[PDB]
Amino acid sequence: MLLITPDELKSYSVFESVKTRPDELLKQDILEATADIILKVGHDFSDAEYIPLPETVRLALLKLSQFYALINGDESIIKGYTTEKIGDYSYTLGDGSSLQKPDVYALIKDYVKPADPDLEGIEAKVRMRSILEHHHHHH
């Protein structure tokens, strides 16, 4: 998942719609945006021993967040009556334009399917999560 906050989104974004929005909604958008960036690189950052967050990534998400937040509850944009937000063509604009996501591919192009083995954090959390106990507390 992302390691940012909803307050930061508005701090950078310019759309009054993204700022005017609450703090709970902003969270949903952010988490929904990171899904796109990860879908491009073809990998996430769940492993606690591998959660890289450069300056290029933080920016890419900041832009994507504002994008969705804009067509997330606008007052002049509709996807022609459809399910929840989808990562496809929709959210028509008053100018009959197709608001497309931000070109943040170059921002993640540096971390898009690297050339490294499975040395990454693997079989480490499963070895501890699947342990008999190794503790003096039963939660």
Curated annotation (Swiss-Prot):
SUPFAM superfamilies registered for this protein in UniProt: Hypothetical protein YqbG
Top-level lineage group: Bacteria
InterPro entries to which the protein is assigned, alphabetical: DUF3199_YqbG, YqbG-like_sf
CDD domains found in the cross-reference section: Yqbg (cd08053)
Assembly, per entry: Monomer.
Record's protein name: Uncharacterized protein YqbG
Gene: yqbG
